[PDB]
Amino acid sequence: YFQSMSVGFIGAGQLAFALAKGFTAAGVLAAHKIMASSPDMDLATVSALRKMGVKLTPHNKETVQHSDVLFLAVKPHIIPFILDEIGADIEDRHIVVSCAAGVTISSIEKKLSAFRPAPRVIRCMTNTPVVVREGATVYATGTHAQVEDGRLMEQLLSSVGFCTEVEEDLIDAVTGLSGSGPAYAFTALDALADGGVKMGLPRRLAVRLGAQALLGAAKMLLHSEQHPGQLKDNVSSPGGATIHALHVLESGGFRSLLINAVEASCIRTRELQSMADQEQ
Amino acid sequence: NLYFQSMSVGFIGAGQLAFALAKGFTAAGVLAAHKIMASSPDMDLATVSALRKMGVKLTPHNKETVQHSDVLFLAVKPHIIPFILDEIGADIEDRHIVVSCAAGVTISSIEKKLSAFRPAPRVIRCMTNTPVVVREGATVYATGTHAQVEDGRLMEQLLSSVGFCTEVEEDLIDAVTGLSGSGPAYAFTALDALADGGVKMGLPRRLAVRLGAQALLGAAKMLLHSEQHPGQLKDNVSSPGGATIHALHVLESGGFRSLLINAVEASCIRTRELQSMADQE
Amino acid sequence: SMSVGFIGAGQLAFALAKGFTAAGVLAAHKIMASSPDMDLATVSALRKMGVKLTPHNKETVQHSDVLFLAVKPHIIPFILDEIGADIEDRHIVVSCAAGVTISSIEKKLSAFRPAPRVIRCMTNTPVVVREGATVYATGTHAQVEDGRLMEQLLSSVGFCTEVEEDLIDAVTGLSGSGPAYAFTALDALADGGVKMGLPRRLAVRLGAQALLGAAKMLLHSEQHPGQLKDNVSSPGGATIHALHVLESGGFRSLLINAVEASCIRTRELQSMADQEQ
Amino acid sequence: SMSVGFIGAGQLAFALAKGFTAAGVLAAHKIMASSPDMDLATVSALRKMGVKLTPHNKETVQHSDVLFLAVKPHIIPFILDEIGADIEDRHIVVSCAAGVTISSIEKKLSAFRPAPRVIRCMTNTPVVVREGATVYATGTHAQVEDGRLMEQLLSSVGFCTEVEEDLIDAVTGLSGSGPAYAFTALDALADGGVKMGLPRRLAVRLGAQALLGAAKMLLHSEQHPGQLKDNVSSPGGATIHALHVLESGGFRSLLINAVEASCIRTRELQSMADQEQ
Amino acid sequence: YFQSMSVGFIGAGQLAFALAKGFTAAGVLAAHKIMASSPDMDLATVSALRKMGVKLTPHNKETVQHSDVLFLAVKPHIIPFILDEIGADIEDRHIVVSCAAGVTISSIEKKLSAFRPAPRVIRCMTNTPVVVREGATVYATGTHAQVEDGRLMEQLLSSVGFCTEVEEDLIDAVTGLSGSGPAYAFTALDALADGGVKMGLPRRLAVRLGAQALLGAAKMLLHSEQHPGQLKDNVSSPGGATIHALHVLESGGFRSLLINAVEASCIRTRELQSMADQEQ
Ligand SMILES: NC(=O)C1=CN([C@@H]2O[C@H](COP(=O)(O)OP(=O)(O)OC[C@H]3O[C@@H](n4cnc5c(N)ncnc54)[C@H](O)[C@@H]3O)[C@@H](O)[C@H]2O)C=CC1
Ligand SMILES: NC(=O)C1=CN([C@@H]2O[C@H](COP(=O)(O)OP(=O)(O)OC[C@H]3O[C@@H](n4cnc5c(N)ncnc54)[C@H](O)[C@@H]3O)[C@@H](O)[C@H]2O)C=CC1
Ligand SMILES: NC(=O)C1=CN([C@@H]2O[C@H](COP(=O)(O)OP(=O)(O)OC[C@H]3O[C@@H](n4cnc5c(N)ncnc54)[C@H](O)[C@@H]3O)[C@@H](O)[C@H]2O)C=CC1
Ligand SMILES: NC(=O)C1=CN([C@@H]2O[C@H](COP(=O)(O)OP(=O)(O)OC[C@H]3O[C@@H](n4cnc5c(N)ncnc54)[C@H](O)[C@@H]3O)[C@@H](O)[C@H]2O)C=CC1
Ligand SMILES: NC(=O)C1=CN([C@@H]2O[C@H](COP(=O)(O)OP(=O)(O)OC[C@H]3O[C@@H](n4cnc5c(N)ncnc54)[C@H](O)[C@@H]3O)[C@@H](O)[C@H]2O)C=CC1
Ligand SMILES: O=C(O)[C@@H]1CCCCO1
Ligand SMILES: O=C(O)[C@@H]1CCCCO1
Ligand SMILES: O=C(O)[C@@H]1CCCCO1
Ligand SMILES: O=C(O)[C@@H]1CCCCO1
Ligand SMILES: O=C(O)[C@@H]1CCCCO1
């Protein structure tokens, strides 16, 4: 529990809700010590945050004045407008944590430094399963972040899933893998359930079994010192059902499609930020 | 309370599934390792050495496993089931609950063999998966002709200690086999490939494996705790024009969904066709 | 009392005028349309409806309060040069042309008279049966009531909402081109019915009715389309077998490809226009 | 004065009862439905509407004049054995089950009482918004007014026409499964809109509205769908570029494949039913 | 001109209209010497026949009593019902010309011989372009057809396009090639017009040019003693536009698709008649 910590979210959408729900469920923050701002209070995420007890305001400057740790939870192209809006309000006490895909620490520090030297900036990439405290988060520390700042952020984000520090040049690739990853999983689970239904299962049972199979397999890999191929080898009996299914996955290039996905998400992330940097 | 039942459990077969279940049950605290006995004609297996390290009793004699057990799991390959039912069928007593885990093998085929000895063998058929080893298995079961209501309830309590467990009609179990039985292998293949994708884009392999596996675990847990359709959860990830919708497009262009349907179908059909051959023999 | 004009008397002018008059929001006699070819079938159909026709774009401007530009995109700069001197304070200029930016229209018109009131829309041919899908963006000098007037008018012939202009090229690829994807699909579904033994007329009727009803269900539902799809398919049944063969062909990706291709072509065409002017 | 019953209280029973009562042709209190599970969401929705619910299929039969069979196809022979002794001269039995033949129904019912009045229909879930597509065939003992009554009832919730029974499995693959093809397409079109920069909610709304309007245009047109498609595409323009990428993927063949697969699976399932009974 | 010839059609659909329009345009038959019967007088083809002056009746027996040459222009599965209906009305003077896809001379003669021995039967396969007198027709003579019967039928069908006698075992293959052929052409013309539209042509002009190109090329081949490949070689200049287009056709397996089509139509024709023969 961080007793003397006030957290704020600029943005009150999917990610702000996911993190606030994760933090409050973890018990590391009380909902009333969290403030979130948004120019649209008609979102289901805003309504959900209100029901949790999170303080809501339309004004980003109030979030800044309330907060010690300030999460930037707006879309990437909104970040430069946000930084110009509240840059004059950043104080020495603030840690600015940008969650926006692609947006570089350099770009954030350049904006904020025009108002006050030495802004404390941390960049993270996380994902929506923080809402069930099983997120995958990486973070990089900025130029003026103190050593305690990174440790504090790792303690906070570790309460809602895996968290580790990385060099910033890995983050766009992490975005393509674990940031976009849940969407690959949801697609796969929808299709696996369709497969169960084709073979005679009710949809509700097929969804439950497919999701439990994926969850269990992921946990096995996380808790094993063994290669995923070895775990795979343990399932298939010679001549059996599983090896027949694996063959039809291979024949469709299943592996290459997932490589294609991570690559496409990473490249698009890099492409979008390159355009943002050209606009500046 | 199941622990205070002091249940003796036996596995005919001492391979991957016997190890996974024994590890899950003992980690759950429902069984003492030394109250489990497993038999195999082959002790040189690595699964047998792991079982022995746990404290499970090991014997080459299937009759010893039967005499020890209260609940008896059949954990041999499907084509070996009729052979061991011939071998120990005379040793099944009225007190036994016989739980077949073998892919494809029907309750009817098991009861026909065992009913030649005692008239009312208590049979349950289940399908589970290796993640019971981390107590996150996906298990279904169907009760046989003579299984008492308390037998299915005991089975559900036991298997719920190592993951999800629900009763089904037997005619669903081959399809379950293709979905959640074979399922972990589809996931391991996907995680290997996702990690390769992370490596291609500049991540160290160890980090890419950790991140991909955490992403899959978290997404699966989200769906299990959500009332929303997976398509809606997917819609919540992807911003307009953004990284995720670009990646989803390349999955669609390869027929990603159809490949997973193909896999479930192929595993289910192979399960059915093997049992048809067995029924013909 | 509102008078409406169409520069251009082609497919879109016909569809909008038919929809407006069927809705009752405009009597045909309040509508004027112009074309340099008074021998088109659309021109004949408009005359039969009661619409006033002229070959002279200046006459349309002098008649109209709301002026729709319904010519091909590459013709827009030509007709703005022709009628720019005739725009007045009362005029609302509504460009329907694919890709053409408010900026490019206002730049041409402002050379003649400051503060042209411009709205850009993207619609589609189903306005002809009052089931169009329309979006609009307001220009620099459009009054607040200009947007509300246009939304009231276009809501009479289908869905209508205001958007930021930078969404319009994407809307073009989705609902602007969308009817053509549907007509292709309906032709193919009918071929499928014929292959399985249905007379062609019945197969066309059933396929179209199925698509209409499914689309209406989705519009009236809070549920995800995947959930509505799940409600159709019984385990092991006919529909899930058919869905598998669609998935195996990458059906979804083809529709994504189509929206993208129409949107990209729209952007590419306007970039070429901007290079010349 | 007509009383209606549903054996089965699932997706189809809900959709038809919602459509009938929205149309005004039936008050909810004239409808009874039965299911062995009174905890389904469809059962709760029917109770909220005013429909009478019972677990006992015999009670539904005793209440009803027109009796809809809305259980899964493999359940039909079981419930015909259960209620066959309770069919009376007044009853019209309307089977909605995919694949199940009039012959198989009449054979079961005639063991109890000669001359059962049987009609077989195929419909689809959009009856829930009164835009269904329904066909029906009359059985051996159905009176002439039985067919006209059923057409009046089912026309209240969509298109309805009489067919020969040997068309019904093909109709199942086209308009019965059809909504699922449309939901798949709408999900994908929305993904395409999102990829090109539209918010998901707007993309879903526009895609669905485009498909609805296009389908309505085809139903109100004498023109071939290819002609309507030709009217959308300007030379060199956005739509023809998008149509090319659909063609390059074999888009049309996938929809033919789907209708065929649903129809063949329907026939295959009924052949298996006929082998067992 | 066949002065003393009355022609009748059992069926008044697409083919009956196409042939009646072709014959009357050729001047070989006056429309009032043609009768057509149908159980549905609400067809556009029936209305078109009425406007031409063709006599219309609902009763197949009246068509038989009126006619000398009797065309069977109903769907193949209707043929056996037709033959049972009017078999007792066939006279010595009648030539029965079956146009139905797949239906064998043997099956027709077996039905009619139960009523009167020695029915004069001819089987043909034609196509819809007889309506513009450019049909492609083949015919086979039955067991009891006199030599003059085949010559008379060739004279009549040659007035509406190409006509030649074949052995009956070629007719199902002809069905897959020139019977179904117009539909392949209409598909190709629709697609070629789409190609013109993509490259900037108005649809009306693209349709006109595509159809004229196909017509001209077909006429060139019909009037040339040269192989289609040689005519093809004469169009393409080295390095030019045409050889570039031919390459993209080859890369898609264009040739194999047309082979697939003829095969699929022929096999389906054989399959359908095999089922008809099983039902008998
Ligand atoms: N959704 C996900 O799965 C994840 C998202 N992210 C990142 O989080 C950020 C937000 O993503 P979502 O929450 O999914 O977007 P979202 O669109 O659900 O929420 C965006 C929020 O920003 C608000 N907003 C717009 N203009 C604003 C302004 N001027 N001041 C304050 N708030 C404003 C919107 O009203 C909305 O509440 C993005 O940069 C994304 O890359 C990172 C990891 C995962
Ligand atoms: N491995 C998996 O992922 C799961 C396997 N299953 C089912 O569990 C059963 C066993 O599968 P695995 O354990 O993977 O096979 P495995 O091959 O690892 O172990 C098979 C065991 O049977 C033993 N055995 C062979 N003949 C025997 C005999 N006459 N008497 C006693 N033991 C004998 C072998 O020595 C070995 O110990 C199969 O029927 C499979 O379908 C079900 C769920 C998941
Ligand atoms: N057809 C559709 O599906 C929709 C079309 N649009 C847009 O509507 C506009 C027109 O589209 P269509 O009506 O389909 O084209 P169309 O070609 O049917 O009509 C074009 C009309 O402009 C006339 N025209 C040519 N030069 C002219 C001039 N100098 N002055 C006045 N009229 C002139 C032509 O004679 C013809 O009447 C295009 O910009 C298109 O992007 C937008 C929504 C959907
Ligand atoms: N869902 C659709 O899109 C359409 C379905 N159909 C046909 O309608 C029938 C039902 O389809 P759905 O409603 O989708 O299935 P559903 O599974 O939603 O409803 C089935 C209902 O039957 C009930 N039931 C099971 N055993 C019963 C018994 N012994 N007595 C009475 N009720 C019993 C179930 O509890 C459930 O209420 C099927 O034959 C299907 O082919 C036809 C047109 C479209
Ligand atoms: N349409 C084509 O391109 C060609 C068709 N054919 C053959 O010509 C025959 C007819 O083909 P279409 O004319 O295309 O079919 P169509 O369906 O246009 O005409 C069929 C006609 O038969 C009538 N009919 C149905 N039952 C009847 C009965 N009991 N007595 C009399 N008339 C009855 C129908 O009312 C309709 O007028 C088929 O056997 C087909 O294989 C052969 C060459 C080309
Ligand atoms: O491949 C196999 O034989 C096994 C069958 C049961 C589920 C796991 O795979
Ligand atoms: O697609 C998107 O905009 C986001 C980017 C961060 C990870 C989730 O996806
Ligand atoms: O897939 C199914 O079982 C149903 C059959 C009727 C039409 C809708 O689909
Ligand atoms: O293809 C075209 O030129 C038009 C653009 C507007 C939407 C309909 O298509
Ligand atoms: O291939 C070629 O170079 C020529 C060009 C004109 C049209 C015929 O082909």
Q: Which residues line ligand 5 (CB under 6 A)?
A: E 10-15, 37-40, 43, 60, 73-76, 78, 81-82, 99-101, 126-128, 179
Yes or no: say if E34 and E92 are a contact pair by the CB < 8 Å rule: no
Let me know if B34 is exposed, middle or buried by CB neighbors in 10 A (0-12, 13-18, 19+).
Answer: exposed
Question: How far, in whole angstroms, is CA D175 from its chain's centroid?
Answer: 8
**Interchain touch B–E (≥3 Cβ pairs closer than 8 Å):** no
Amino acid identity of residue B168, one-letter, is V
Q: Which of D200, D205, D257 to mutate to test the interface with B (most CBs of B within 10 A)?
A: D200
**Number of residues that this document lists for chain B:** 281
SS3 B126: strand
Rounded Cα–Cα distance for residues B127 and B129 (Å): 7
Any idea what DSSP says for residue B117?
T
Question: How far, in whole angstroms, is CA A107 from its chain's centroid?
Answer: 20
Give yes or no for residue B242 CB within 6 A of ligand 7: yes
Give D98 Cα–ligand 8 centroid separation in angstroms: 6
Q: Which residues contact D146 (CB under 8 A, 6 or more apart)?
A: D92, D117, D119, D138
Per-residue CA distances from B176 to A19, A209, A214, A242, C240 (Å)? 35, 8, 14, 12, 17
Give the residues across from E161 on adjacent strands: E135
List of E strands, chain B: 9-12, 36-39, 57-59, 71-74, 97-100, 122-127, 137-143, 163-167
Rounded Cα–Cα distance for residues A185 and C53 (Å): 59
Any idea what DSSP says for residue B6?
T
Tell me which of D32, D72, D168 to substitute to probe ligand 4's pocket, judged by most ligand atoms within 8 Å of the beta carbon.
Answer: D72
Torsion sign (Cα): B252, B255, B261, B267: negative
Q: Which residues contact D237 (CB under 8 A, 6 or more apart)?
A: C98, C265, C269
- Taking CB atoms and an 8 Å limit, are D243 and E203 in contact across chains? no
At what angle are helices A181-198 and B205-225 packed, to 10 degrees? Answer: 60
Rounded Cα–Cα distance for residues E211 and C277 (Å): 38
Q: Among all chains, which residue has been given the structure tokens 């997917």?
A: B234
Residue E188 labelled as part of a binding site: no
Chain D positions touching B237 (Cβ under 8 A) are none
Element at A71 (helix H, strand E) = strand A69-72
- Pull the structure tokens for residue C52: 């006033």
Rounded Cα–Cα distance for residues B230 and B227 (Å): 9
Rounded Cα–Cα distance for residues A270 and A256 (Å): 21
Give C232 Cα–ligand 8 centroid separation in angstroms: 6
Q: Does C222 touch chain A (CB under 8 A)?
A: no
Rounded Cα–Cα distance for residues B21 and B101 (Å): 11
Q: Which residues line ligand 6 (CB under 6 A)?
A: A 235-237, 240-242; B 103, 177, 181-182
Element at A9 (helix H, strand E) = strand A7-10
- Taking CB atoms and an 8 Å limit, are D235 and E194 in contact across chains? no
Yes or no: say if D251 and C252 are a contact pair by the CB < 8 Å rule: no
Query: Closest partner residue to C182 among D215, D263, D264, by Cβ?
Result: D215
Chain B, 42 to 61: residues with Cβ < 8 Å from chain C are: none
Rounded Cα–Cα distance for residues E250 and C60 (Å): 52
Q: Which residues line ligand 9 (CB under 6 A)?
A: C 98, 172, 176-177; D 232-234, 237-239
Give A206 Cα–ligand 2 centroid separation in angstroms: 25
Rounded Cα–Cα distance for residues C199 and C203 (Å): 6
Resolution in A: 1.7
- Taking CB atoms and an 8 Å limit, are D195 and B241 in contact across chains? yes
Give the per-residue SS3 of chain C: CCCEEEECCCHHHHHHHHHHHHHCCCCHHHEEEECCCCCCHHHHHHHHHCCEEECCHHHHHHHCCEEEECCCHHHHHHHHHHHHHHCCCCCEEEECCCCCCHHHHHHHHHCCCCCCEEEEEECCHHHHHCCEEEEEEECCCCCHHHHHHHHHHHHCCEEEEECCHHHHHHHHHHHHCHHHHHHHHHHHHHHHHHHCCCCHHHHHHHHHHHHHHHHHHHHCCCCCHHHHHHHHCCCCCHHHHHHHHHHHCCHHHHHHHHHHHHHHHHHHHHHHHHHHC
Rounded Cα–Cα distance for residues C26 and C46 (Å): 14
Chain C positions touching A194 (Cβ under 8 A) are 240, 243-244, 247
Any idea what DSSP says for residue A240?
S
Yes or no: say if A145 and A121 are a contact pair by the CB < 8 Å rule: yes
> Which residues precede chain breaks (C–N over 2.5 Å) in chain A?
none
Give B180 Cα–ligand 6 centroid separation in angstroms: 10
- Pull the structure tokens for residue B268: 């289910």
Chain D positions touching E202 (Cβ under 8 A) are 235
Give phi and psi for B95, each to the nearest 5. Answer: -75, -15
* End-to-end C-alpha distance for chain E, whole angstroms: 40
**Number of residues that this document lists for chain D:** 277
- Taking CB atoms and an 8 Å limit, are A198 and C240 in contact across chains? yes
Helix-, strand-, coil-residue percentages of chain A, each rounded to 5:
60, 15, 25
- Taking CB atoms and an 8 Å limit, are A212 and B136 in contact across chains? yes
Give the per-residue SS3 of chain D: CCCEEEECCCHHHHHHHHHHHHHCCCCHHHEEEECCCCCCHHHHHHHHHCCEEECCHHHHHHHCCEEEECCCHHHHHHHHHHHHHHCCCCCEEEECCCCCCHHHHHHHHHCCCCCCEEEEEECCHHHHHCCEEEEEEECCCCCHHHHHHHHHHHHCCEEEEECCHHHHHHHHHHHHCHHHHHHHHHHHHHHHHHHCCCCHHHHHHHHHHHHHHHHHHHHCCCCCHHHHHHHHCCCCCHHHHHHHHHHHCCHHHHHHHHHHHHHHHHHHHHHHHHHHC
Give C41 Cα–ligand 3 centroid separation in angstroms: 13
Residue B258 to chain D, least CA–CA distance (Å): 13
Yes or no: say if A33 and A3 are a contact pair by the CB < 8 Å rule: no
- Taking CB atoms and an 8 Å limit, are C253 and B257 in contact across chains? no
Yes or no: say if D258 and D172 are a contact pair by the CB < 8 Å rule: no
Per-residue CA distances from A182 to B184, C60, D67, D200, E135 (Å)? 17, 56, 47, 18, 61
Let me know if D120 is exposed, middle or buried by CB neighbors in 10 A (0-12, 13-18, 19+).
Answer: buried
Q: Does E199 touch chain D (CB under 8 A)?
A: yes
Q: Does B271 touch chain A (CB under 8 A)?
A: yes
Q: Does B253 touch chain C (CB under 8 A)?
A: yes
Give B174 Cα–ligand 6 centroid separation in angstroms: 10
Rounded Cα–Cα distance for residues A65 and D230 (Å): 60
Q: Does D197 touch chain B (CB under 8 A)?
A: yes
Yes or no: say if E32 and E7 are a contact pair by the CB < 8 Å rule: no
Tell me which of E40, E74, E104 to substitute to probe ligand 5's pocket, judged by most ligand atoms within 8 Å of the beta carbon.
Answer: E74
Q: Which atom of ligand 1 is nearest to the CA of A127?
A: 44
SS3 A96: strand
Query: Closest partner residue to E199 among D233, D236, D243, by Cβ?
Result: D236
Q: Among all chains, which residue has been given the structure tokens 């940008």?
A: A98
Q: Which of B172, B245, B257 to mutate to test the interface with D (most CBs of D within 10 A)?
A: B245
Per-residue CA distances from B185 to A47, A178, B230, B274, D138 (Å)? 40, 20, 21, 20, 51
Q: Does D128 touch chain C (CB under 8 A)?
A: yes
Give A14 Cα–ligand 1 centroid separation in angstroms: 7
DSSP secondary structure letters along chain E: --TT--EEEE--SHHHHHHHHHHHHHTSS-GGGEEEE-S-TTSHHHHHHHHHT-EEES-HHHHHHH-SEEEE-S-GGGHHHHHHHHGGG--TT-EEEE--TT--HHHHHHHHHTTSSS-EEEEEE--GGGGGT-EEEEEEE-TT--HHHHHHHHHHHHTTEEEEE--GGGHHHHIIIIITHHHHHHHHHHHHHHHHHHTT--HHHHHHHHHHHHHHHHHHHHH-SS-HHHHHHHHPPTTSHHHHHHHHHHHTTHHHHHHHHHHHHHHHHHHHHHHHHHH-
